[PDB]
Amino acid sequence: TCSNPLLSGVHTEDNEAEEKALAEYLLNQEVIHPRVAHAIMEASSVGRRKQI
């Protein structure tokens, strides 16, 4: 029920889709680095939604 103009896009519906997609892009690679992928997800907009 968030309706103020500030923090508008914090709750969307493809949040799970973006989160799963970004985690799958970062982790499913040649070498798996979970700490730096956690840092990248934390730095991107998904981590900004989680931190808000």
Added chain:
Amino acid sequence: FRTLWRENTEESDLTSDKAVGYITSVVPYRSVSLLHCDIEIPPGSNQSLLDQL
């Protein structure tokens, strides 16, 4: 060249039996050809201090 400091300082002061035990544990038995002793003594010390030294 080898020093004689096993990180402990009453093995350095020659008014201590631990100095004798440490140095005679390190140095081989009767192998020094030139011993030297450049020690100082404070003025008016204990007589037993000089005895132990």
Added chain:
Amino acid sequence: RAEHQIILPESHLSSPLVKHKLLYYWKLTGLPLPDECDFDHLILSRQWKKILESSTPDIERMIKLGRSVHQTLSHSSKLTGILHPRCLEDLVGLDIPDSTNKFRRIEKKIQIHNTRYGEPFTRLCSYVEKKLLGSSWTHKIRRSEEFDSLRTDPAFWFHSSWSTAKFAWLHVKQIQRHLIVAARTRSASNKLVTLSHRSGQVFITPELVIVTHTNENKFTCLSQELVLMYADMMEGRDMVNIISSTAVHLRCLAEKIDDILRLVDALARDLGNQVYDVVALMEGFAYGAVQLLEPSGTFAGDFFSFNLQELRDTLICLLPQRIADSVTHAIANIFSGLEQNQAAEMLCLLRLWGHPLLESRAAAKAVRAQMCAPKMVDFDMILQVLSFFKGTIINGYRKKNAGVWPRVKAHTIYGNVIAQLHADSAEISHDIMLREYKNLSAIEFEACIEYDPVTNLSMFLKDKAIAHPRNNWLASFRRNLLSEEQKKNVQDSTSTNRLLIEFLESNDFDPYKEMEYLTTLEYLRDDSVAVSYSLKEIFAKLTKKLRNCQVMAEGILADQIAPFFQGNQDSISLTKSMLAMSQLSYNSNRKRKHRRRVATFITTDLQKYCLNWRYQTIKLFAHAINQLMGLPHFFEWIHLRLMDTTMFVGDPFNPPSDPTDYDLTKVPNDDIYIVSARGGIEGLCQKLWTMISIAAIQLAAARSHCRVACMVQGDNQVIAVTREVRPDDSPESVLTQLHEASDNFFRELIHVNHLIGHNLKDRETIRSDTFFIYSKRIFKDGAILSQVLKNSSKLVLVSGDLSENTVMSCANISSTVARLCENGLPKDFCYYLNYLMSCIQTYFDSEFSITSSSN
């Protein structure tokens, strides 16, 4: 059905103790009310006939419990109900064998745990110390004596004094919580559990617990959050007794603690609630027992003698003179002979007799005695503080923006020195602020700071209650207890009045538009602004839009204007800064190659700080910050709003007494009301008042020619006054220069706080050469002074309320055991202590569970 088994009733006390909640359920049951409540202002004015006709289950339980108490107890003599805290020593000795039998099973199983696993803990701890400290530090190092007393006495938790009361009150608390969870579901069996204890009976319902002593023909009723308080204090003082009797360097405290624990418990039988005036002094005696160890003649025993003086001067107003002198003698003989660490360990005796019963009438009296009081301030000292205020703003802006002064109105620079410092853009020294204060305080600024209104956003998302506005303010009280003509004005609320939820659900939120509620003075037009003071011993309830502007003003100040001042981080940065500040003590550098820098310390706490600020003092400081922002009228809003409105102490179980109260603009400056408040409310505008106090401390530094390191939050102020001594100087002259600097700065601090209307509690302020006091920790000569017993009094047995979570409870136990080990215990003791207390926890959840309806 099963939804109601989630948000379980809270298992430790986390809310104030309202007296009239207990009084409400006392009269709502059929029992005689206690003796000091015979002329009560809220008991003798309600319509009790209509209340008992409501026939809710809440009232029916109390009626049946009243009949149950009448039937099991004497009819011949006089029924005497006694009120907390006059029943402390009686409930101290509660002894239910029906629950001691339930705890001996846990005791037996944990003695089995020791007898099958105690020696491998010895082998583990000797292993770890042998691996970390080599096999040469092992022929003469063995286990500690705390570990040995833990190893030979596995049931330490079961075999102290206060253990039987701990068993009884934990059992009664768990039965109470079970009864509340059962009474959430509307269908119910008999909700009256009767336990049988030594010379009496205990009656347990979802609203009250009644303890009846039959030989004395007396009884007492305890509300829903008062058995939580008794259970918390019983397991707290039991754990304090355990730790102080097993720790080797603390054994001399244990008997001392027991003596003082019984001493006040006698005094509560005739001081009543006023005995919480005596408990409030106990803190000072600990500080008084540290200041006995000063390295001089001066500053020695002053605050000990002051606390002892105030102790006798409060006891003689109630007790006989011989008894008061003997009690003062016993207090002085308990706190005498304490070591450095022990005298700071005696701060555990703070929350250990529990809490006074609060009521709204006395609290509103104590507020309006200091808030509607007139004040007379001094214009010249205001100009001196304002000159240092603007000088610190100029130095902060010139440090931040690379050597450039802020945008000053050019024709308002007066004098030649300030004109030269302007045209050279230099740093204004404190001497030029003090000498040219008449020309510096008259300076102005222009709009030269870009701000952000919604800077933080972690503060808009707080769960803070919002006082629903002054047309609907009677909905703050329980509708059961309003009168009839007052009950028509209680409207219904489609909101939750929470800052979080109503921040999220407010379309068309613009922060710049919301600041126009203060810049344009529309907040002073509005006739729907209410302020609600809370029953505490810091919290207020504003309306929505006023709370929004308050949070915005705090964001604007802590963003930009606040970090200009060196007085106000991180728990490592604080233990670096305060530790280095204590490195400057006399004793830390008594090795008497430039001038050595030494210091002596002043910890003060101003008398009634937040509500002695008036508009007339803060307006020029707020005016400076307004001109610096370009805002017409922003930061002086609090006094101008509180002058135009009246406010009330909000509490459900404390309605207004006189039932003819409709409008706030008509009620007298009486029962719960405060009309035209002049002071400020704590936490609101805290940054501005902090900054004004930093300006006053630097002014008192400059007026006595001393350099000062100050750390101040709100009313807690810690000052190191400094001195630069030569290596060829005697220690007597070092102490002499330090004490003259201390007395000179202390006189000037008293003086500059007096002329702007602030007492320091100037004989409660603690001057010392050795220690200072910050955030209830004592810093003495570069060592932090230990508080194991405070952390032992929080070694409790249920954590969290969201379920019967055992894992989070064991996690709380482990974090408090680590917090003990940091204050200095043996390591092996704390490790095996956590093992035993986790075992106590995990057997305490199989029994004593309030929802087992398989393990």
Added chain:
Amino acid sequence: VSSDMCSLALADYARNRSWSPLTGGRKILGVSNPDTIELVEGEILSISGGCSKCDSGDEQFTWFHLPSNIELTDDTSKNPPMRVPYLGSKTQERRAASLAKIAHMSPHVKAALRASSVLIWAYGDNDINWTAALKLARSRCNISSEYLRLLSPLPTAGNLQHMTFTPASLYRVSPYVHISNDSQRLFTEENVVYQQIMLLGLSLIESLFPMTVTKTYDEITLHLHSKFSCCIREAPVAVPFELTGVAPDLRVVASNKFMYDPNPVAEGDFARLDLAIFKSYELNLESYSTVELMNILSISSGKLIGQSVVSYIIVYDNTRNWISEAQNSVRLFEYAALEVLLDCSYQLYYLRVRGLNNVVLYMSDLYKNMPGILLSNIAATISHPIIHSRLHTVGLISHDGSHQLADTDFIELSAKLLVSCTRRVVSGLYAGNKYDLLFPSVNEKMLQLISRLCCLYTVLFREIPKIRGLPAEEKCAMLTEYLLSDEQVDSITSVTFPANLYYMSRKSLNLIREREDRDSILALMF
């Protein structure tokens, strides 16, 4: 696996086997740090023989020393000095004044540059990873790829982040303990592990003295040895590649100030940033030789020494070391002395310090009795035994005026090295030589620095034309007028800007760390 393997082999086996359905046989790595207790073996020496570890062929340890006869009372007239003990440095986080910088970056820009640096550090440096890093950093800000290729900081440690008042312990004996760390070579980096060892050692030292003790009586040394551990891992090789697949869409709004910076970079940033783009085409530093990189560290560890300490209350010990930067360079203290001379040429000129043997005497005045006493950076630098041995070889440090321990705490020997390097630079400039004046932030500053060199020449090379009170151009014209009224003239009549001095320092330091021929070139200069 079994019970008797070191715990990180077991934890890596557990992570691999537990994620094996999702992962499919690949090795989850970059995660495990060893247990601090299982890592080290300790030894305490108090009154007798030394550590049986270091007697048995061990070399690598940390060293903790508590003195004797320490009172824990208010009678404290025989104690050792009391300093603020080691609390633990996270990284001692600096404000972002980075490798190309903007003073007022919004936190979204910080998050974007953090993401770009971490991504390039982990997965390599090529076009695919910069495409992915651009795609991810668009979700927080609105900058182009050319800004990410330079504003992104150098990859050091930046994956770290994710109470009222609780002190970490009592501090009774830990303010007195001497910590030293210089006998650890593979566990001493920029790293978490030696921070853990330094905290464990202080907690063991304070564990030795229970609360019933007010007096220590002996000296105590810890060796925390960390060499023959079963948890000794070899640092693996990060082999770069390209991120297979495309980075996802990551939609974002321009409305949320809390989630998105719409316009970070401004016009006063536009000009100097795209001039740095233009000049950043000479950053082919991998193609350069190693000795030229050592020249870059000579002018780069230099020319900062002499800017912090020449500008022309609770004091801490929060000091730089310069202890690995000089361990790799080839004389940087020469450029330190040159920076101090070029800074102080104003007061050299206004006192009219003439001739050869008065400039060095005025520098001896300013160095020997500097009114500031905080030379503690070089005093912490040159006390290192390798650096002290190098300066005793070539660099002209004096012989010590006491025993080598108590030689004025090295806060005054650094002034002696400054005097020696100052006269070496003055004798070099008199003798027809110059120095490679790599002066960054590239005009006001160019004619300024030429006026500095001409002012040094003017006081070093009749009546001196007083240029006091003038603007810069009249000063430059009158000094060039006065000098050209007679090799040395070639020095009078006459470098670049790849990037700023800190980037040329750190990048070259790391590239010299990347070389393999560094040992033989170290042995070439003894």
Added chain:
Amino acid sequence: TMRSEIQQLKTSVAVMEANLGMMKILDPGCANVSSLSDLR
């Protein structure tokens, strides 16, 4: 002339003492049983 000089200096002295340091500022707080509409 110097005749108005000492007059202006003594009037400025009377301002500098009588307006400046000798000036105290009173908030008459409402320490009395009254309503808000009474004070309005």
Added chain:
Amino acid sequence: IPTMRSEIQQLKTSVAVMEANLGMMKILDPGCANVSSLSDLRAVAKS
């Protein structure tokens, strides 16, 4: 005559601070709460 005019100049810069202090004395009254902060304190004192 320089000792004439220096007295006059310091009377200017020490009389102007009295208007600057009377404006401050005016705005401490809660009546003058509409007098916005962006106003010259001399000109507040003169009206």
Added chain:
Amino acid sequence: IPTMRSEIQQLKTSVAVMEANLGMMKILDPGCANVSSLSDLRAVAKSHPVLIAG
């Protein structure tokens, strides 16, 4: 210097300002004549905050 007479034309005039307003300020005498009620604050809020600069 004939300028200073005109500056007297400033200074005395400014003194004629000060005694103009110091008789208008609510100096407390024994008797409590010129006391102010709360409602004046209430009367000030009803308009926007004004500027008395120049």
Added chain:
Amino acid sequence: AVMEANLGMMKILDPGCANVSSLSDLRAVAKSHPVLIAGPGDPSPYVTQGGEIALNKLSQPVPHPSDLIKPDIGIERDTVRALILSRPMHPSSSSKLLSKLDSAGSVEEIRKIKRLALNG
């Protein structure tokens, strides 16, 4: 000028530092001020015929000035036992100080033992 013609001094009688009795002393040393009404309200309960205003330690006008006006033997003995028992001291000297302390009988010579205990 007319600077002293209207600024009626109002005889402010601050306690400030000292707080001794006898209002004669407070009437004597009391610098006079031109107080200025700023806040809304009625100060007539706080002024007095004679033109005087008595302030508190919180700079509060109090209606009748005698509220400011408003020794022990046991507290001194207890504090000096606290000093003797609590400070570091040789045991025989501490016992001999403790012996001749119950023999005291006035506030005088408790102070002698106090300045003999801190300085001994």
